[PDB]
Amino acid sequence: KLKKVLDKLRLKRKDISEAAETVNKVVERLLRRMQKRESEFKGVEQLNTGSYYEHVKISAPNEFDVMFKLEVPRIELQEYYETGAFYLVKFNPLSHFLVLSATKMLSKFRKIIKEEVKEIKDIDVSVEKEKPGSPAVTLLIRNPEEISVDIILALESKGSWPISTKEGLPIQGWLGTKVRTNLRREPFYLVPKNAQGETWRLSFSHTEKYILNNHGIEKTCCESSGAKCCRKECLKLMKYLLEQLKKEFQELDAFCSYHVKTAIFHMWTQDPQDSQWDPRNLSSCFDKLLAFFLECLRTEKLDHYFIPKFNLFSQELIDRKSKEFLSKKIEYERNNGFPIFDK
Amino acid sequence: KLKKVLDKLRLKRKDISEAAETVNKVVERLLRRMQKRESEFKGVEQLNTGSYYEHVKISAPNEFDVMFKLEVPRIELQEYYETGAFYLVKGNPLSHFLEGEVLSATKMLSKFRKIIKEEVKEIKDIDVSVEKEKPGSPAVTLLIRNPEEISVDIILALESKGSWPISTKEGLPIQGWLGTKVRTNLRREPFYLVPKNAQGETWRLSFSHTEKYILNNHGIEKTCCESSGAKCCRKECLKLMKYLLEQLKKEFQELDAFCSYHVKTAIFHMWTQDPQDSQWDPRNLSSCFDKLLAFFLECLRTEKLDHYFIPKFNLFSQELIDRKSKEFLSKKIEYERNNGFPIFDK
DNA sequence: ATCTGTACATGTACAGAT
DNA sequence: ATCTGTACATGTACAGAT
DNA sequence: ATCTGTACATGTACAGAT
DNA sequence: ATCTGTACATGTACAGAT
Ligand SMILES: Nc1ncnc2c1ncn2[C@@H]1O[C@H](COP(=O)(O)O[C@@H]2[C@H](O)[C@@H](COP(=O)(O)OP(=O)(O)OP(=O)(O)O)O[C@H]2n2cnc3c(=O)[nH]cnc32)[C@@H](O)[C@H]1O
Ligand SMILES: Nc1ncnc2c1ncn2[C@@H]1O[C@H](COP(=O)(O)OP(=O)(O)OP(=O)(O)O)[C@@H](O)[C@H]1O
Ligand SMILES: [Mg+2]
Ligand SMILES: [Mg+2]
Ligand SMILES: [Zn+2]
Ligand SMILES: [Zn+2]
């Protein structure tokens, strides 16, 4: 049943092969351009992020997320109000972008990508119209199949993480205190998402990647000499329910996969043992994930896993009407064996 | 009962504090002297190894082990007669130690030793001499009188960043215990060659750095022994075994062939045999220690104790230790085992 | 003026002491 | 139970060198 | 600085065994 | 139906060469 949905959602080895080679062709060429041209983004290094690289992509290999991280010689951050996740960057190449303005830096970035994309004759690839706010430059590829690639510009800072994350990332009873201390020794990132035009947002896409691939309390969880768990299959099922519901109801435009990602990070923290995620219990795991997500909706409360004061379900960001709509549609599919999965 | 031996074995913070103060002064001075003039060992880097940095040093903080490791490219190893553990290494500053292509180990260790002895001669804050050279030892031992006697093994080590030698391919069998990602990463760490002998140009593989990692990341659960996880008795068992051997080794010179590396190796195998943290519950410390003794006894009797990292190397082979010596320790361990461990009260 | 090997500065797991 | 010294990892400053 | 080579993780695909 | 074993595929860390 739920197994059979997971069979349907599984990407195909050939589809992975074909899509990956076209995306890699494009992304390498853009990344060359930022380097072997004396631009403000020389030094930018590639970091792959998102569900395709976390092995939780469903249905088709048709969406890829790539960070072009750029190391910045220190530091000065100022928190935008007390939102937790938005910051003004203050303090050379980047002199053309002044306070370091996200909009002006993104526009140059965007302008380089668009130029280099006009110079692609090998692949059918366009630049999607800019979505205000959003930190991404989105490529639309078409080797028959439609594939979209998000090129995310990011700042890399090696200093300690901002104070708003001090109580974040609570993996101590799950992944433990050494894993946490080491993760927090990694750099943190800032992306040019706005709010207004000078604000950057914290990104922890590199930390979420590690956690998805290091998700057990036992070191052998999901390894060739360990037990398989069903944590990723539960994420996929929950991502699938929201994709089907969003595709049908335009009332759900304000929800996104990151809401599902954040909720299941919390669930994993509350149920740390690998046995609470035994494959033979895929049903009650998916069901307890649903119950948790409904508790989040009912209480209009879903805190950023790394930034606890930042409520992703705050009234300011999603209306109570949108949440009660989602809770009714979800409770429905739940109590009727998920008809939506058969579409 | 066994909880009380461990209390006796526990180090005292005051002793730790005074001992580490002097040791760090001396070591830092030797390391800085290695970085000066036209010194061949310039670039050498420091790596603290051994039981003190693993937190399984027992009774007193009176024996420290430090590698002075030196990176070298080129590599070109040649295994010494299928033994698994011993190798030949084939304006370069190490030029003075070549014997045509081949890096002589005793030549390097002499020049290393001459430098340490000179630096100890100029030390006047601390009472420290250099111990007479021991055959079959890559160390330059310092004896410090801190009033208290404290020895320091300065181990000279070559560092190589290439893949580990073929003889370790089937070694380090942690896949069911610490798992395969940890194994892959560990084997991406460099490996080390110390000048232990066999003749003056043979080096021995060293994995002190890997053993130090394993000692401090020893559980199947990532939270083993952490402040939000369960305590285990894996290190408490190793301590008790170190102590049984130490007590016995200082009464019976029938046991000079045996060393604490033997008990360290047997227990890496026990930790592989019994991966789960539940097989090392603190409340089953008697039975845990007991199975470890059973295991060590079988190794003595079958004379077989494979190097944890180099499987074809048998530390209990007949060419290394007599049947005589192994049977003598089998009786003495069996005796302690079945009479309440009277040696613990000495 | 800039560069850099060295050593300070920061943070925290570990485990002994209270 | 909390307090606390040592070890160790990684970031950063700077006297002396270029 | 840039790039290739190497190893093995995480996947998919499928047949023979259970 | 599920487990095991082998082939097949891409992603990623980093040593060594240039
Ligand atoms: N912080 C970020 N780090 C890296 N990439 C980011 C980040 N924030 C945004 N992006 C990328 O920009 C596009 C638009 O961003 P929005 O913030 O406007 O909306 C996000 C998006 O609509 C959705 C999920 O996107 P994603 O592709 O990352 O999903 P996935 O995990 O790879 O799985 P699937 O593709 O299979 O669904 O969630 C929104 N969102 C809100 N906050 C965050 C966040 O903190 N991190 C990531 N996404 C967030 C996006 O397409 C995104 O790629
Ligand atoms: N025979 C050996 N073969 C391989 N490695 C060895 C051998 N003897 C010692 N070593 C390595 O050198 C380290 C130091 O050895 P040493 O004899 O000081 O033991 P230890 O583990 O430090 O314990 P203790 O000092 O309490 O006896 C060991 O931890 C091990 O990594
Ligand atoms: Mg995505
Ligand atoms: Mg020692
Ligand atoms: Zn798992
Ligand atoms: Zn433990």
Author numbering:
A (entry chain C): 149 to 239, 246 to 252, 256 to 352, 359 to 506
B (entry chain A): 149 to 238, 245 to 352, 359 to 506
Paper text:
Cyclic GMP-AMP (cGAMP) synthase (cGAS) is essential for the host defense against cytosolic double-stranded (ds)DNA arising from various maladies (e.g., pathogen invasion, ionizing irradiation, and genotoxic chemicals). Upon directly binding to and dimerizing on dsDNA, cGAS cyclizes ATP and GTP into 2′−5′/3′−5′-linked cGAMP, a unique metazoan second messenger for initiating type-I interferon (IFN-I)-mediated inflammatory responses. cGAS is central to antitumor immunity, host defense against an array of pathogens, and regulating autoimmunity. Here, we resolve these numerous fundamental mechanistic questions in innate immunology and present a unifying catalytic mechanism of cGAS. Finally, we reveal how mouse cGAS achieves more stringent substrate selectivity and higher catalytic efficiency than the human enzyme. Together, we set forth a unifying catalytic mechanism of cGAS in which dsDNA-binding pre-organizes the active site into a rigid yet adaptable lock for two sets of keys (substrates and intermediate) necessary to specifically synthesize 2′−5/3′−5′-cGAMP.
To test whether such a precise NTP-specific coordination is critical for cyclization, we soaked Mg2++ITP/GTP, ATP/ITP, or GTP alone into WT-mcGAScat•dsDNA, all of which produced respective linear dinucleotides bound at the active site. Next, we identified pppIpA based on how the nucleoside at Site-2 resembles the adenine of pppGpA; Arg364 was also pushed away as seen from pppGpA and the 3′-OH was in position for catalysis. Nevertheless, the second Mg2+ was again missing, and the α-phosphate of pppIpA appeared misaligned compared to pppGpA (bottom). These observations suggest that the H-bond between the α-phosphate and the -NH2 of guanine is important for positioning the metal•intermediate complex for cyclization. C–E Comparing pppGpA-bound QN-mcGAScat•dsDNA vs. WT-mcGAScat•dsDNA bound to pppGpI (C), pppIpA (D), and pppGpG (E). Importantly, our results consistently indicate that any deviations from such a precise coordination would prevent cyclization: any misalignments of the 3′-OH nucleophile (pppGpI) or the α-phosphate electrophile (pppIpA) would disrupt catalytic metal binding, and the enzyme-mediated intra-dinucleotide interactions would trap pppGpG in a nonproductive state.
